[PDB]
Amino acid sequence: NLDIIGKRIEKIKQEHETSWHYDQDHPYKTWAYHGSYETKQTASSMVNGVVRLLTKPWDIIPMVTQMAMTFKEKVDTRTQEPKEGTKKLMKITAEWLWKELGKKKTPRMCTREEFTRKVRSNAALGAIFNKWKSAREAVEDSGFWELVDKERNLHLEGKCETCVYNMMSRAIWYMWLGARFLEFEALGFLNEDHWFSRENSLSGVEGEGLHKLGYILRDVSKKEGGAMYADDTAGWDTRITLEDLKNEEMVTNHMEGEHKKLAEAIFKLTYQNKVVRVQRPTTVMDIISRRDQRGSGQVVTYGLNTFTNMEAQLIRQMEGEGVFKSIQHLTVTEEIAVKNWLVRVGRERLSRMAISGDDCVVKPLDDRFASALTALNDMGKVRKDIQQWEPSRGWNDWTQVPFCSHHFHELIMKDGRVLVVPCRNQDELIGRARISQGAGWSLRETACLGKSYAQMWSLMYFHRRDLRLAANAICSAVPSHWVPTSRTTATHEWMTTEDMLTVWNRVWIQENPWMEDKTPVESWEEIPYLGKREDQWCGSLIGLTSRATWAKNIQTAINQVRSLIGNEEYTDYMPSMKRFRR
Ligand SMILES: [Zn+2]
Numbered sequence: 051n052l053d054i055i056g057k058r059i060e061k062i063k064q065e066h067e068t069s070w071h072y073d074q075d076h077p078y079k080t081w082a083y084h085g086s087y088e089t090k091q092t093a094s095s096m097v098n099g100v101v102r103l104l105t106k107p108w109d110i111i112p113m114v115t116q117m118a119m120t121f122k123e124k125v126d127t128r129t130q131e132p133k134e135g136t137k138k139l140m141k142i143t144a145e146w147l148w149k150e151l152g153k154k155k156t157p158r159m160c161t162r163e164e165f166t167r168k169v170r171s172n173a174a175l176g177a178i179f180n181k182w183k184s185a186r187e188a189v190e191d192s193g194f195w196e197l198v199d200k201e202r203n204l205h206l207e208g209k210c211e212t213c214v215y216n217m218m219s220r221a222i223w224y225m226w227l228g229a230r231f232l233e234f235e236a237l238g239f240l241n242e243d244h245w246f247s248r249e250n251s252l253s254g255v256e257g258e259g260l261h262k263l264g265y266i267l268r269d270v271s272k273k274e275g276g277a278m279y280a281d282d283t284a285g286w287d288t289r290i291t292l293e294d295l296k297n298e299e300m301v302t303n304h305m306e307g308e309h310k311k312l313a314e315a316i317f318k319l320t321y322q323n324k325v326v327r328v329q330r331p332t333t334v335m336d337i338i339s340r341r342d343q344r345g346s347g348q349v350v351t352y353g354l355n356t357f358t359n360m361e362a363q364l365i366r367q368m369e370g371e372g373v374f375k376s377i378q379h380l381t382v383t384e385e386i387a388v389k390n391w392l393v394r395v396g397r398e399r400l401s402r403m404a405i406s407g408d409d410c411v412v413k414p415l416d417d418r419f420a421s422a423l424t425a426l427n428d429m430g431k432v433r434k435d436i437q438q439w440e441p442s443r444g445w446n447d448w449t450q451v452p453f454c455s456h457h458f459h460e461l462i463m464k465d466g467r468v469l470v471v472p473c474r475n476q477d478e479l480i481g482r483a484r485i486s487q488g489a490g491w492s493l494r495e496t497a498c499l500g501k502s503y504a505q506m507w508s509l510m511y512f513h514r515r516d517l518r519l520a521a522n523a524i525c526s527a528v529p530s531h532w533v534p535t536s537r538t539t540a541t542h543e544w545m546t547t548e549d550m551l552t553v554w555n556r557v558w559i560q561e562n563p564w565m566e567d568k569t570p571v572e573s574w575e576e577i578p579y580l581g582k583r584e585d586q587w588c589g590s591l592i593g594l595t596s597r598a599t600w601a602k603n604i605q606t607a608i609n610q611v612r613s614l615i616g617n618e619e620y621t622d623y624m625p626s627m628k629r630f631r632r
């Protein structure tokens with residue numbers, strides 16, 4: 051308690067000693083509340099004008115246009131501690147899982163040099179701006195690294211001063227850039243060294259890319275077993291128990307020297323005890339604390355979510371196979387049985403899953419899994435939009451399963467070769483490309499973001515008639531040599547000035563392990579579309595009058611955007627499609 055958090059709290063109180071007070075009408079029940087001080091301040095969504103001018107039919111589609119307008123009453127909730135039988139299953143499974151992930155990997159510290167390179171190439175690290183302006187600036191100063199050096203030696207002493215969360219179905223907890231360095235130094239290896247790649251973790255998909263997820267779901271479908279289950283959890287981050295945080299900390303058992311101590315300190319001082327500043331309009335700054343729930347950097351959060359999800363789903367599979375009978379207490383021979391299951395079939399049962407953070411697909415041995423709910427509910431991983439004791443509804447067709455906000459189609463090329471392609475409702479794809487994050491964007495920067503969306507559509511969504519046409523239009527409207535950009539950077543093969551047909555061939559043919567015949571595709575016309583009815587089912591405007599006018603008059607929209615940007619070198623990509631090829 052206050053021995054671990056006091057120092058952080060005391061230090062803040064003293065920077066606002068002119069403002070402190072224990073407000074008696076604080077809303078917190080489940081958070082520990084400490085005090086309050088004086089502040090005043092808030093980045094809403096802006097429209098990308100290049101993308102919107104080239105998608106005019108969508109100006110009248112509420113699903114597109116509403117996306118651009120506009121539970122912190124779930125962050126204030128508590129989870130009960132699991133039963134003793136549940137706690138035993140989780141500790142045995144976690145122990146075994148860290149050993150498996152470790153067999154072919156070596157834990158290691160990430161470097162100033164690696165972190166400095168991350169900020170300089172614009173990753174979304176989720177830090178606060180104060181003493182320096184940007185993230186770039188503070189990285190190029192030595193005073194910073196003294197603050198870092200100071201906090202670091204405090205961590206080795208088992209103490210914390212400056213590692214505080216700032217709060218803001220999402221809630222991003224920004225930390226100061228220094229606190230993010232020390233997290234990245236201790237636990238960056240999980241992401242940097244691909245601990246959750248498919249090859250290493252068997253259930254994981256870290257770094258696989260959207261062009262491989264469909265093929266991975268089809269490979270899971272090839273296994274003998276029951277339906278495919280894809281239950282979402284209601285607010286996963288809010289349901290992470292202190293027992294979860296302690297089984298995650300067992301990765302430190304594979305570490306040594308300084309690393310082991312630095313990683314134990316992140317787990318002990320920042321994760322298993324947390325200090326958070328919240329704004330309350332009633333504008334005060336509330337200093338609250340608690341022990342449980344997820345608050346890490348977004349990237350370490352991904353890896354630990356994947357780990358704990360993999361653990362939860364193996365246990366649900368154990369329950370369906372009848373490996374154990376009660377969660378109240380594990381007998382001694384029930385333990386031996388669980389350990390024996392893990393050693394005997396654990397790796398085969400991991401290969402039956404696809405897991406991305408809080409998101410999962412499981413093809414269990416059979417449909418007993420559907421009603422195996424006691425361990426899952428008792429671990430606090432309660433399923434979204436279904437009654438707590440109602441059996442899961444599984445999918446019988448891999449092409450209908452949802453995963454990472456997508457579904458996957460089987461698409462046969464004119465030469466008989468088989469693509470497995472990602473897809474989602476086209477309104478969602480167009481509404482997102484029409485949004486820019488943050489203010490102060492030049493026309494040039496707005497255009498380069500449009501071009502990033504266009505190249506992603508050509509690579510991932512080429513099979514949607516409206517997106518191949520809009521992607522060609524945007525790339526015709528933006529100067530040919532201008533480089534695609536993004537402010538919060540899966541694998542991103544569309545982020546290049548290389549020719550998109552050359553990239554398409556590399557991604558879908560050359561480097562695609564499910565394609566035996568490596569014959570290159572010579573033109574965009576060899577590359578197929580979904581059937582027209584399927585394209586409509588997934589939101590195409592093909593067949594509407596608005597869409598026909600747009601398509602027919604596309605050169606006029608392209609010319610409007612070229613005139614705004616000015617006298618630059620442009621390419622006409624529209625003749626890459628049959629209907630504009632004269
Ligand atoms: Zn600290």
Ligand SMILES: [Zn+2]
Binds near residue numbers: 474
């Ligand atoms: Zn679709």
